[PDB]
Design a protein around this ligand. Structure first.
Ligand code: 3ZK
Ligand code: NAG
Length: 336
Protein backbone atom coordinates (compact mmCIF):
# COMPACT_ATOMS: atom_id res chain seq x y z
CA UNK A 1 0.00 0.00 0.00
CA UNK A 2 1.31 3.48 -0.96
CA UNK A 3 0.36 6.75 0.76
CA UNK A 4 1.26 10.40 0.05
CA UNK A 5 3.69 10.96 2.93
CA UNK A 6 7.47 11.34 3.36
CA UNK A 7 9.08 11.78 6.69
CA UNK A 8 12.62 12.98 7.42
CA UNK A 9 15.10 12.60 10.33
CA UNK A 10 17.80 15.25 10.84
CA UNK A 11 21.21 13.66 11.49
CA UNK A 12 24.14 14.87 13.61
CA UNK A 13 27.58 14.62 12.05
CA UNK A 14 30.23 13.88 14.71
CA UNK A 15 33.72 14.58 13.22
CA UNK A 16 32.88 13.03 9.79
CA UNK A 17 33.00 9.53 11.38
CA UNK A 18 29.59 9.13 13.07
CA UNK A 19 26.14 10.08 11.76
CA UNK A 20 23.08 9.54 13.93
CA UNK A 21 19.57 10.86 14.55
CA UNK A 22 16.97 10.51 17.29
CA UNK A 23 14.17 8.06 17.93
CA UNK A 24 11.72 7.93 20.87
CA UNK A 25 10.93 4.56 22.52
CA UNK A 26 7.98 4.03 24.89
CA UNK A 27 5.22 6.03 26.63
CA UNK A 28 6.31 8.68 27.62
CA UNK A 29 9.15 8.54 24.96
CA UNK A 30 12.74 7.88 26.07
CA UNK A 31 14.98 9.41 23.39
CA UNK A 32 18.03 7.72 21.87
CA UNK A 33 20.80 8.78 19.48
CA UNK A 34 20.77 6.03 16.84
CA UNK A 35 22.68 5.10 13.66
CA UNK A 36 20.41 4.31 10.66
CA UNK A 37 22.36 1.31 9.39
CA UNK A 38 21.82 -0.36 5.96
CA UNK A 39 24.42 -2.97 6.93
CA UNK A 40 22.18 -4.41 9.73
CA UNK A 41 18.48 -5.29 10.20
CA UNK A 42 17.87 -5.08 13.96
CA UNK A 43 16.78 -2.19 16.18
CA UNK A 44 18.69 -2.01 19.49
CA UNK A 45 19.42 0.42 22.33
CA UNK A 46 21.33 -0.04 25.68
CA UNK A 47 19.08 -1.43 28.47
CA UNK A 48 18.59 -0.34 32.10
CA UNK A 49 19.34 -4.07 32.78
CA UNK A 50 22.95 -3.60 31.51
CA UNK A 51 25.45 -4.23 34.35
CA UNK A 52 27.14 -0.90 35.29
CA UNK A 53 30.52 -2.84 35.23
CA UNK A 54 30.20 -2.34 31.39
CA UNK A 55 31.46 1.32 31.40
CA UNK A 56 29.73 1.86 27.90
CA UNK A 57 26.36 1.57 29.65
CA UNK A 58 27.35 4.20 32.28
CA UNK A 59 28.04 6.59 29.24
CA UNK A 60 24.87 5.87 27.17
CA UNK A 61 21.11 6.42 27.48
CA UNK A 62 19.49 3.20 28.78
CA UNK A 63 15.97 2.05 27.97
CA UNK A 64 13.96 1.40 31.15
CA UNK A 65 10.88 -0.81 30.45
CA UNK A 66 9.60 -0.04 34.01
CA UNK A 67 8.97 3.57 32.88
CA UNK A 68 7.00 2.73 29.73
CA UNK A 69 3.24 2.00 29.82
CA UNK A 70 3.22 0.74 26.17
CA UNK A 71 6.00 -1.83 26.69
CA UNK A 72 5.35 -5.51 25.82
CA UNK A 73 7.60 -8.21 27.32
CA UNK A 74 9.29 -10.79 25.06
CA UNK A 75 12.59 -11.89 26.60
CA UNK A 76 14.14 -13.93 23.71
CA UNK A 77 17.99 -13.74 23.78
CA UNK A 78 19.69 -11.86 20.94
CA UNK A 79 23.40 -11.70 20.03
CA UNK A 80 24.52 -9.19 17.37
CA UNK A 81 28.00 -9.73 15.95
CA UNK A 82 29.75 -6.95 14.08
CA UNK A 83 33.28 -7.04 12.62
CA UNK A 84 34.07 -4.33 15.24
CA UNK A 85 32.59 -6.04 18.30
CA UNK A 86 29.55 -7.86 19.81
CA UNK A 87 26.38 -6.84 21.69
CA UNK A 88 23.83 -9.10 23.34
CA UNK A 89 20.64 -8.76 25.31
CA UNK A 90 16.97 -9.65 24.87
CA UNK A 91 13.95 -8.76 22.75
CA UNK A 92 11.27 -6.23 23.84
CA UNK A 93 8.36 -4.49 22.08
CA UNK A 94 7.26 -0.88 22.35
CA UNK A 95 6.15 2.17 20.35
CA UNK A 96 9.04 3.83 18.39
CA UNK A 97 8.81 7.40 16.99
CA UNK A 98 10.95 8.14 13.90
CA UNK A 99 10.53 11.55 12.22
CA UNK A 100 6.77 11.77 12.79
CA UNK A 101 6.02 8.06 12.07
CA UNK A 102 4.84 6.04 15.16
CA UNK A 103 5.39 2.27 14.87
CA UNK A 104 5.03 -0.78 17.22
CA UNK A 105 8.41 -2.40 16.96
CA UNK A 106 10.35 -5.37 18.36
CA UNK A 107 13.88 -4.27 19.37
CA UNK A 108 16.83 -5.56 21.39
CA UNK A 109 17.55 -4.29 24.89
CA UNK A 110 21.35 -4.62 25.04
CA UNK A 111 22.73 -5.87 28.38
CA UNK A 112 26.33 -6.56 27.19
CA UNK A 113 28.12 -3.58 25.54
CA UNK A 114 31.96 -3.77 25.30
CA UNK A 115 34.03 -0.60 25.87
CA UNK A 116 35.70 -1.22 22.51
CA UNK A 117 34.02 0.14 20.36
CA UNK A 118 30.98 1.47 22.30
CA UNK A 119 32.92 3.89 24.66
CA UNK A 120 33.92 5.64 21.39
CA UNK A 121 30.30 5.77 20.21
CA UNK A 122 28.45 9.13 20.28
CA UNK A 123 25.25 7.22 19.46
CA UNK A 124 23.41 4.95 21.95
CA UNK A 125 21.98 2.40 19.52
CA UNK A 126 21.16 1.26 15.99
CA UNK A 127 18.12 1.32 13.71
CA UNK A 128 18.79 -1.46 11.18
CA UNK A 129 17.71 -0.41 7.65
CA UNK A 130 18.55 -3.88 6.20
CA UNK A 131 16.15 -6.70 5.08
CA UNK A 132 14.35 -9.34 7.30
CA UNK A 133 16.65 -12.01 5.67
CA UNK A 134 19.61 -10.69 7.76
CA UNK A 135 17.55 -9.90 10.89
CA UNK A 136 18.80 -11.84 13.94
CA UNK A 137 15.93 -13.84 15.49
CA UNK A 138 13.95 -13.14 12.24
CA UNK A 139 12.53 -9.94 13.86
CA UNK A 140 10.55 -7.69 11.44
CA UNK A 141 12.75 -4.62 10.55
CA UNK A 142 11.38 -1.11 11.29
CA UNK A 143 11.17 -0.12 7.58
CA UNK A 144 9.04 -3.26 6.86
CA UNK A 145 6.72 -2.20 9.76
CA UNK A 146 6.55 1.37 8.30
CA UNK A 147 5.70 -0.02 4.76
CA UNK A 148 2.85 -2.12 6.38
CA UNK A 149 1.18 1.16 7.55
CA UNK A 150 0.69 2.13 3.86
CA UNK A 151 1.54 5.79 4.61
CA UNK A 152 4.80 6.27 2.52
CA UNK A 153 4.69 7.85 -0.99
CA UNK A 154 7.31 5.28 -2.22
CA UNK A 155 8.83 2.09 -0.82
CA UNK A 156 12.29 3.86 -0.66
CA UNK A 157 14.49 5.77 1.81
CA UNK A 158 17.49 7.95 1.10
CA UNK A 159 20.64 9.26 2.81
CA UNK A 160 22.44 12.61 2.79
CA UNK A 161 25.72 12.84 4.81
CA UNK A 162 27.21 16.35 4.95
CA UNK A 163 30.94 17.32 5.42
CA UNK A 164 31.58 18.53 9.07
CA UNK A 165 31.19 22.27 10.01
CA UNK A 166 27.18 24.40 12.98
CA UNK A 167 24.94 23.29 9.97
CA UNK A 168 22.87 20.17 8.90
CA UNK A 169 24.82 16.98 9.82
CA UNK A 170 22.81 14.90 7.36
CA UNK A 171 19.29 13.70 6.55
CA UNK A 172 17.34 10.41 6.03
CA UNK A 173 14.14 10.74 4.04
CA UNK A 174 11.66 7.88 4.50
CA UNK A 175 9.29 7.48 1.54
CA UNK A 176 11.37 9.45 -0.99
CA UNK A 177 14.48 11.61 -1.66
CA UNK A 178 15.29 15.32 -1.19
CA UNK A 179 16.31 17.17 -4.44
CA UNK A 180 17.84 20.00 -2.33
CA UNK A 181 20.70 17.57 -1.39
CA UNK A 182 21.57 16.12 -4.84
CA UNK A 183 21.99 17.32 -8.39
CA UNK A 184 21.77 15.62 -11.70
CA UNK A 185 19.99 12.28 -11.96
CA UNK A 186 20.10 9.02 -10.09
CA UNK A 187 22.09 6.17 -11.62
CA UNK A 188 20.73 2.85 -10.33
CA UNK A 189 22.46 -0.50 -9.68
CA UNK A 190 20.27 -3.55 -8.99
CA UNK A 191 21.03 -5.65 -5.91
CA UNK A 192 22.85 -8.95 -6.61
CA UNK A 193 20.00 -10.54 -4.57
CA UNK A 194 17.18 -9.31 -2.26
CA UNK A 195 18.03 -9.60 1.46
CA UNK A 196 21.26 -7.46 1.47
CA UNK A 197 22.07 -3.83 0.30
CA UNK A 198 24.89 -5.25 -1.86
CA UNK A 199 25.70 -4.49 -5.48
CA UNK A 200 28.25 -5.81 -8.01
CA UNK A 201 31.46 -3.75 -8.36
CA UNK A 202 33.53 -4.12 -11.58
CA UNK A 203 36.86 -2.54 -10.77
CA UNK A 204 38.61 -0.18 -8.32
CA UNK A 205 41.17 2.14 -9.93
CA UNK A 206 44.02 4.12 -8.32
CA UNK A 207 44.74 6.96 -10.76
CA UNK A 208 44.09 5.94 -14.40
CA UNK A 209 44.72 2.15 -14.24
CA UNK A 210 42.27 -0.46 -12.76
CA UNK A 211 44.64 -1.93 -10.20
CA UNK A 212 41.90 -3.77 -8.18
CA UNK A 213 38.62 -5.78 -8.44
CA UNK A 214 39.57 -6.53 -12.15
CA UNK A 215 37.47 -9.73 -12.34
CA UNK A 216 34.58 -8.17 -10.37
CA UNK A 217 33.77 -7.99 -6.65
CA UNK A 218 31.02 -7.02 -4.18
CA UNK A 219 30.08 -3.63 -2.72
CA UNK A 220 27.97 -3.39 0.43
CA UNK A 221 26.42 0.14 0.58
CA UNK A 222 26.70 0.61 4.36
CA UNK A 223 25.28 3.81 5.99
CA UNK A 224 26.42 2.53 9.44
CA UNK A 225 30.08 2.38 8.39
CA UNK A 226 32.41 5.42 8.72
CA UNK A 227 34.73 4.51 5.85
CA UNK A 228 35.15 2.80 2.51
CA UNK A 229 36.45 -0.66 3.45
CA UNK A 230 37.95 -3.62 1.58
CA UNK A 231 39.42 -7.00 2.67
CA UNK A 232 42.90 -6.98 4.39
CA UNK A 233 44.37 -8.17 1.03
CA UNK A 234 42.72 -5.50 -1.23
CA UNK A 235 43.55 -2.69 1.26
CA UNK A 236 47.23 -3.83 1.39
CA UNK A 237 47.50 -3.51 -2.40
CA UNK A 238 45.51 -0.17 -2.44
CA UNK A 239 47.66 1.34 0.34
CA UNK A 240 50.97 0.27 -1.35
CA UNK A 241 49.69 2.01 -4.54
CA UNK A 242 49.02 5.19 -2.42
CA UNK A 243 52.27 5.01 -0.41
CA UNK A 244 50.56 4.65 2.99
CA UNK A 245 51.94 3.22 6.27
CA UNK A 246 49.95 0.73 8.37
CA UNK A 247 49.27 1.38 12.01
CA UNK A 248 47.12 -0.64 14.50
CA UNK A 249 43.59 0.19 13.17
CA UNK A 250 44.20 2.65 10.30
CA UNK A 251 46.48 3.75 7.46
CA UNK A 252 48.37 7.02 7.36
CA UNK A 253 50.29 9.27 4.93
CA UNK A 254 52.61 12.18 5.84
CA UNK A 255 50.19 15.17 5.97
CA UNK A 256 52.17 17.17 3.28
CA UNK A 257 51.72 14.25 0.77
CA UNK A 258 47.90 14.01 1.25
CA UNK A 259 46.74 16.52 -1.46
CA UNK A 260 49.07 14.85 -4.07
CA UNK A 261 47.44 11.37 -3.63
CA UNK A 262 45.66 9.91 -6.72
CA UNK A 263 41.91 9.71 -7.30
CA UNK A 264 40.18 6.47 -6.34
CA UNK A 265 37.40 5.31 -8.71
CA UNK A 266 34.75 2.68 -8.03
CA UNK A 267 33.11 1.11 -11.09
CA UNK A 268 29.42 0.55 -10.25
CA UNK A 269 26.75 -0.12 -12.87
CA UNK A 270 27.01 2.32 -15.74
CA UNK A 271 29.31 4.96 -14.13
CA UNK A 272 32.81 5.47 -12.45
CA UNK A 273 32.43 6.93 -8.90
CA UNK A 274 35.55 9.00 -8.27
CA UNK A 275 36.80 10.24 -4.90
CA UNK A 276 39.76 12.71 -4.89
CA UNK A 277 42.32 12.80 -2.05
CA UNK A 278 40.22 15.65 -0.50
CA UNK A 279 37.29 13.15 -0.22
CA UNK A 280 39.25 10.33 1.56
CA UNK A 281 42.09 12.08 3.49
CA UNK A 282 41.51 13.60 6.93
CA UNK A 283 43.61 16.64 6.01
CA UNK A 284 44.17 17.93 9.61
CA UNK A 285 47.41 19.77 8.58
CA UNK A 286 49.96 20.00 5.72
CA UNK A 287 52.98 19.33 7.99
CA UNK A 288 55.78 17.02 6.79
CA UNK A 289 56.24 16.24 10.59
CA UNK A 290 52.62 14.94 11.06
CA UNK A 291 50.65 11.86 10.01
CA UNK A 292 47.21 12.01 8.37
CA UNK A 293 44.60 9.22 8.60
CA UNK A 294 42.84 7.95 5.46
CA UNK A 295 39.07 7.27 5.38
CA UNK A 296 39.68 3.72 4.00
CA UNK A 297 40.55 0.77 6.17
CA UNK A 298 40.56 -3.03 6.08
CA UNK A 299 37.45 -4.90 7.22
CA UNK A 300 37.10 -8.65 6.73
CA UNK A 301 33.33 -9.10 6.59
CA UNK A 302 32.52 -12.83 7.12
CA UNK A 303 30.55 -15.00 4.60
CA UNK A 304 27.87 -15.17 3.13
CA UNK A 305 27.95 -11.28 2.95
CA UNK A 306 31.76 -11.13 2.80
CA UNK A 307 34.45 -11.05 1.46
CA UNK A 308 33.15 -7.64 0.28
CA UNK A 309 33.95 -3.95 0.01
CA UNK A 310 31.82 -1.55 2.03
CA UNK A 311 30.87 1.96 0.85
CA UNK A 312 30.37 3.89 4.09
CA UNK A 313 30.17 7.61 5.05
CA UNK A 314 33.32 8.42 2.96
CA UNK A 315 31.38 7.41 -0.20
CA UNK A 316 27.85 8.68 0.83
CA UNK A 317 29.29 12.17 1.58
CA UNK A 318 30.25 12.46 -2.11
CA UNK A 319 27.15 10.54 -3.41
CA UNK A 320 23.53 10.99 -2.19
CA UNK A 321 22.10 7.43 -1.88
CA UNK A 322 18.54 6.15 -2.48
CA UNK A 323 17.69 2.62 -1.23
CA UNK A 324 14.81 1.27 -3.34
CA UNK A 325 12.90 -1.61 -1.65
CA UNK A 326 10.21 -1.70 -4.40
CA UNK A 327 12.77 -2.46 -7.20
CA UNK A 328 15.71 -3.99 -5.19
CA UNK A 329 18.15 -1.34 -6.36
CA UNK A 330 20.36 1.50 -5.06
CA UNK A 331 20.52 4.93 -6.74
CA UNK A 332 23.47 7.36 -6.54
CA UNK A 333 23.55 11.06 -7.44
CA UNK A 334 26.19 13.76 -6.78
CA UNK A 335 25.42 15.27 -3.35
CA UNK A 336 24.83 19.14 -2.96
C1 3ZK B 1 28.51 6.49 9.64
O1 3ZK B 1 28.22 6.64 11.04
C2 3ZK B 1 27.77 5.42 11.65
C3 3ZK B 1 28.50 5.22 13.00
C4 3ZK B 1 29.99 4.87 12.77
O2 3ZK B 1 30.62 4.50 14.01
C5 3ZK B 1 30.70 3.19 14.53
C6 3ZK B 1 30.16 2.05 13.89
C7 3ZK B 1 30.31 0.79 14.50
C8 3ZK B 1 29.75 -0.42 13.77
O3 3ZK B 1 30.66 -1.13 13.36
N1 3ZK B 1 28.43 -0.66 13.50
C9 3ZK B 1 28.07 -1.90 12.75
C10 3ZK B 1 28.52 -1.95 11.26
C11 3ZK B 1 27.82 -0.96 10.31
N2 3ZK B 1 26.99 -1.75 9.38
C12 3ZK B 1 26.85 -3.10 9.95
C13 3ZK B 1 28.24 -3.31 10.58
N3 3ZK B 1 29.28 -3.65 9.61
S1 3ZK B 1 29.98 -5.11 9.51
O4 3ZK B 1 31.08 -5.03 8.58
O5 3ZK B 1 30.31 -5.59 10.82
C14 3ZK B 1 28.68 -6.07 8.79
C15 3ZK B 1 28.04 -5.62 7.62
C16 3ZK B 1 27.04 -6.41 7.03
C17 3ZK B 1 26.68 -7.65 7.59
C18 3ZK B 1 25.57 -8.51 6.94
C19 3ZK B 1 27.33 -8.10 8.74
C20 3ZK B 1 28.33 -7.31 9.34
C21 3ZK B 1 27.36 0.17 14.11
C22 3ZK B 1 26.26 0.85 13.26
C23 3ZK B 1 26.83 -0.57 15.38
C24 3ZK B 1 31.04 0.65 15.69
C25 3ZK B 1 31.56 1.78 16.34
C26 3ZK B 1 31.42 3.06 15.75
O6 3ZK B 1 32.00 4.22 16.30
C27 3ZK B 1 32.66 4.21 17.58
C1 NAG C 1 8.69 -12.90 21.03
O1 NAG C 1 8.37 -12.34 19.74
C2 NAG C 1 8.30 -13.31 18.68
C3 NAG C 1 8.04 -12.55 17.39
O2 NAG C 1 9.18 -11.79 16.99
C4 NAG C 1 7.21 -14.33 19.01
O3 NAG C 1 7.05 -15.27 17.95
C5 NAG C 1 7.56 -15.02 20.33
O4 NAG C 1 6.56 -15.98 20.66
C6 NAG C 1 7.69 -13.98 21.45
N1 NAG C 1 8.09 -14.62 22.70
C7 NAG C 1 7.50 -14.36 23.89
C8 NAG C 1 8.01 -15.16 25.05
O5 NAG C 1 6.61 -13.52 24.03
Amino acid sequence: TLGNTTSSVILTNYMDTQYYGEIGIGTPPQTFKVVFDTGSSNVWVPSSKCSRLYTACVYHKLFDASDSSSYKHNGTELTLRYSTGTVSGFLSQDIITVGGITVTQMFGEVTEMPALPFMLAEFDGVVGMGFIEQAIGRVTPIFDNIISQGVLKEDVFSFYYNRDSQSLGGQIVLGGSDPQHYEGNFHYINLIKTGVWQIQMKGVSVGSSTLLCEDGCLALVDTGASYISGSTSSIEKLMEALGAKKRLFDYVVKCNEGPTLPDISFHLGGKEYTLTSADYVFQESYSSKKLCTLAIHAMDIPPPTGPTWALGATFIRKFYTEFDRRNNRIGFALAR
